[PDB]
Structure 1
Amino acid sequence: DNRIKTVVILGGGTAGWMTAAYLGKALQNTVKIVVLEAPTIPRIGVGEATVPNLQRAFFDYLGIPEEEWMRECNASYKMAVKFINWRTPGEGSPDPRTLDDGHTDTFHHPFGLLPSADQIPLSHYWAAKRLQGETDENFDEACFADTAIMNAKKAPRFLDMRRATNYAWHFDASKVAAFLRNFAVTKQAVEHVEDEMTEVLTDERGFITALRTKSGRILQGDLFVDCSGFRGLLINKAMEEPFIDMSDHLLCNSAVATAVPHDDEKNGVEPYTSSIAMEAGWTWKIPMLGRFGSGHVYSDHFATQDEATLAFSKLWGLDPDNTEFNHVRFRVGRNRRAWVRNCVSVGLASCFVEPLESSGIYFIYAAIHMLAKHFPDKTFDKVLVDRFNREIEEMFDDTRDFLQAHYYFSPRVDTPFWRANKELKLADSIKDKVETYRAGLPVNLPVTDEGTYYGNFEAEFRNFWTNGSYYCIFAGLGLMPRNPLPALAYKPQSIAEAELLFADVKRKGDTLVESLPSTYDLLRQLHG
């Protein structure tokens, strides 16, 4: 019997407690699971955003109903990330400026998959019309009914909880953590040890045998999961695995954040996350129940903590002398390997990017998912570890490339930050995709319906940023194909078919704006 008998997880928060809860279920009570979590002074909830797979892939697997966890964590609803002022120069403002062409400088990145006609995504029909002056509609409004719903701040479900669209979640991460801790301990026989780690004990081959706590207690184990955050106490310090810094792709490295009380009854609640462009980065806005989380992500090469804190306060008209701010310095990049010997990194300790496209919890989920599938025995087969490592690095680099694209193809050059972004080099694979897009071809074409895509994690994992997401961002920022897909010039029936799709999107949006409750009302209904 060469089986792992004990798993020790260093660190709590979302990474630790998602890991504990997930492996709790996956390992079917054959393995003891211990979490060693430093107790800390609970910081203010600056808000986290997620992607739609979270309920099916994670909470449904644990048997936790959506309303149960949402009610505990003050969760709200997300239908997109909405980008504001990424094309126009100026001070940071919550209000969108106007483009040269008269359009408002906003664009959406909603969920779901684009419909197709004659096996060609709606995006391409839109682009054919836009390039030839047959439409002045933006890509997002023409191709996603969700755009209309969001503009009127309506909910993704009706008041009887009938689904109208795809959505994900906004929530306070520490609340989800507390909830999962509670779940894992009471329901799954996970042991919680509230203490700090002082020693990492290793055998002759450099495999971890145990952690010592600050109280002297030794926690023996066979597999160790590093959820220690940015310090990477196991993977980087103890195992000495180098972190690959990727600040030559993404300049932002700091954040200042707070929670802002909000008159929901008065203003409504946005069913989306906003990315508000600033002079030296951007600011998130994550509406929750009664408050929104916000954080100004910035490069400290281009702004001091005071400068950034001042500009951020100014967005919302905060008193910086009378406001509670969390300041964070980020690691941006990933370990050379996520898993070395019998030490597996998950979360911040593995890798990180700014939450520009809500990567944080997805990255955690993907790791634990891949860990359960690549779960080892005590012989730690080199191939098993290698394939796991391979998935994390492809996952990471791919999302990295996608985020750089947001900065690289921004037309802004008004501050040294925005100028500096146009000096960085793109990786080959995102260059390749830009080339493909620009010839009018789809990038990462969806080959699946939504049911399959959001019902089977592995389907989404192999095609995470689809053609639709590429169109949302490139087109959103003003990057268009050089020309339409040439096949379209030969396909009048197919063009007619696409007109019907365009009309279905208008009709759905109009009908659903008319009949849907406000996001605000749906929240009241849910949290009553």
Structure 2
Amino acid sequence: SGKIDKILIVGGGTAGWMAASYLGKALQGTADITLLQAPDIPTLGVGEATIPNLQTAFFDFLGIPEDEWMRECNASYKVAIKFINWRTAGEGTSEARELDGGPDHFYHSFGLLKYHEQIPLSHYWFDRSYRGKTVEPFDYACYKEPVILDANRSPRRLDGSKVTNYAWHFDAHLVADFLRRFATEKLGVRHVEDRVEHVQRDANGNIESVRTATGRVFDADLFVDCSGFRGLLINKAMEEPFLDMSDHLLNDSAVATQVPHDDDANGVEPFTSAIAMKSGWTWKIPMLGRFGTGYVYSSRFATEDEAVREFCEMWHLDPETQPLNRIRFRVGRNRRAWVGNCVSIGTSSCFVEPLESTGIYFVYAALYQLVKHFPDKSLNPVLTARFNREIETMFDDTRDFIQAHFYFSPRTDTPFWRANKELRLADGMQEKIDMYRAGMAINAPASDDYGNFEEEFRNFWNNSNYYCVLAGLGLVPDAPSPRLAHMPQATESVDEVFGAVKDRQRNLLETLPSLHEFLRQQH
């Protein structure tokens, strides 16, 4: 026993330096931290989309202002994820097809859903919809974001004031470098360039040390595995098994690239695009002067060649000369994230396709859970088990949520879209759906007011999130919430709360600058 004196982080990508920075800040001056990383074959900056608490739960914790890291990571703004062509049949194209008089898209934005007499606006929307009182989509009726996003507006006025919740788009490599400099320079984290040659464990199954290719042996009390999909420590050394989640998620591959973009001519979209394809979907992450894009697909329904072709044709790129990143993912999670004195953080722990921008979130959320369940040398088993429970539900809930994007799509045009309907939802997901169909809110927020992590983490996917995606795809309740028939005054008075959103939509549309205009001035 005695406190943890030394920590060794293995792996130096985004997760590695995020861990180095978070732990370095949390245990400042009370633990010696070293990170081991060797040169990997370089990849293109295909983009990363994020969520609001990246600032409040991560950069704020580090004491780094939004403007400080944005400027050095050449970041752009994200207000939502625009889902394109998830309800219509056809080829993989960047242009939205037509559906019921308008483009086939729906937004899942960050804006929150206001209550009315203790009930989510979603329920009132559906009540009117079901009774043929409105035909307006859920997102446009309940959020002000869609209208201003259709016009590529900025989430901030030129004077800097914020009008909507938003997150970021950026090249992950730049953030990693920014953090590497911050950790080594400001937090005293020791960076060592070496390749793991051997991991020495003891009779208790814990890691004693790791010997590198140069012969240096690194011993520590706690080992953090940020080696990525390889899982050098957690899977390879500790032999912890990985749980393949292919019975819920068919997508396991990707071919991506970065495309130059003239922002002066076309402007910049304040949102991540999730473009439905024939055997998966494609992301478009707008940055400054370019956009990252990647086709996430299922190797079971498309060969790598076919994916490359579909992806390149969609963007009018030459398959033979376009610099491409061909990736095969390890989808799922370890049976246990933390075993013995080895904690896995990042993709070494778990991974799911970036359909809902959880990649970086999974890292700082887990780091928050590690510090909260921080052990000493006795390694109390309870801290470890509880940590694993939080990680396990964090992932499985996201897994379920994501599967629902595919399971509930109305498309039947390709073998892929049809196969998704043939998979089964996890029992916990089916219950949420049962609830949704019964007119109940799903994990409704206690308040309609991203500032407190514990609260966010505990209620990550809430009623708003589920309605955006579910209603967006077309899945709606079997009937209105029975409680509304007993609230005539409330259903009469909503007309003015739906009116407030319309006014906000109109006023923001006519007063906000374009995202490009705002970026152009800030620069």
Superposed pair shares fold, TM > 0.5: yes
Equivalent of 2:465, from 466, 469, 479?
469
Q: Which amino acid aligns with 2:329?
A: F
Q: Distance in 2 between matches of 1:486 and 1:404?
A: 29
Percent identity of paired positions between Structure 1 and Structure 2: 63
Cα deviation for residue 431 of structure 1 reads 0.6
Contact 2:224 2:342 (C-alpha < 8 Å) held by counterparts:
yes
Cα deviation for residue 17 of structure 1 reads 0.5
**RMSD, aligned α-carbons:** 1.0
Query: What SS does the aligned partner of 2:34 have?
Result: strand
Q: Distance in 1 between matches of 2:455 and 2:111?
A: 13
Q: Distance in 2 between matches of 1:73 and 1:304?
A: 34
Correspondence 1:246 to 2:245: yes
Q: Distance in 2 between matches of 1:401 and 1:40?
A: 33
Query: What SS does the aligned partner of 1:455 have?
Result: coil
Correspondence 1:509 to 2:508: no
Cα deviation for residue 510 of structure 1 reads 1.1
| Matching of residues 97-112 of structure 1 within 5 Å | 97-99=97-99, 101-112=100-111
Query: What SS does the aligned partner of 2:67 have?
Result: helix
Query: What SS does the aligned partner of 2:355 have?
Result: coil
Q: Distance in 1 between matches of 2:15 and 2:122?
A: 36
Cα deviation for residue 28 of structure 1 reads 2.3
Contact 2:279 2:416 (C-alpha < 8 Å) held by counterparts:
yes
Q: Distance in 2 between matches of 1:38 and 1:526?
A: 36
Deviates more, 1:515-524 or 1:228-237: 515-524
| Matching of residues 110-509 of structure 1 within 5 Å | 110-450=109-449, 454-509=450-505
Partner of 1:30: 30
The normalised TM-score by structure 2 is 0.99
The normalised TM-score by structure 1 is 0.98
Query: What SS does the aligned partner of 1:34 have?
Result: strand
Query: What SS does the aligned partner of 1:471 have?
Result: helix
Q: Distance in 1 between matches of 2:249 and 2:488?
A: 43
Q: Which amino acid aligns with 2:96?
A: P
Contact 1:210 1:220 (C-alpha < 8 Å) held by counterparts:
yes
Moved over 4 A (4+): none
Q: Distance in 2 between matches of 1:227 and 1:509?
A: 44
Q: Distance in 1 between matches of 2:448 and 2:404?
A: 27
Partner of 1:2: 2
Query: What SS does the aligned partner of 1:276 have?
Result: strand
Partner of 2:518: 522
Query: What SS does the aligned partner of 2:169 have?
Result: strand
Cα deviation for residue 132 of structure 1 reads 1.2
Cα deviation for residue 495 of structure 1 reads 1.4
Q: Distance in 2 between matches of 1:196 and 1:160?
A: 49
Q: Distance in 1 between matches of 2:416 and 2:293?
A: 21
Q: Distance in 2 between matches of 1:131 and 1:106?
A: 21
Contact 1:113 1:446 (C-alpha < 8 Å) held by counterparts:
no
Cα deviation for residue 437 of structure 1 reads 0.8
Q: Which amino acid aligns with 2:76?
A: S
Q: Distance in 1 between matches of 2:64 and 2:437?
A: 44
Contact 1:440 1:484 (C-alpha < 8 Å) held by counterparts:
yes
Cα deviation for residue 499 of structure 1 reads 1.4
Q: Distance in 2 between matches of 1:495 and 1:150?
A: 28
Contact 2:111 2:145 (C-alpha < 8 Å) held by counterparts:
no
Cα deviation for residue 464 of structure 1 reads 0.7
Contact 1:81 1:274 (C-alpha < 8 Å) held by counterparts:
yes
Deviations 1:342-387 (A, max 9, x none): 0000111000000000010010111100001111111100001000
Q: Which amino acid aligns with 1:187?
A: K
Q: Which runs of 5+ in 2 are unaligned?
A: none
Q: Which amino acid aligns with 1:313?
A: C
Cα deviation for residue 202 of structure 1 reads 1.3
Q: Distance in 1 between matches of 2:511 and 2:197?
A: 58
Cα deviation for residue 497 of structure 1 reads 2.5
Correspondence 1:62 to 2:58: no
Contact 2:209 2:218 (C-alpha < 8 Å) held by counterparts:
yes
Cα deviation for residue 526 of structure 1 reads 2.4
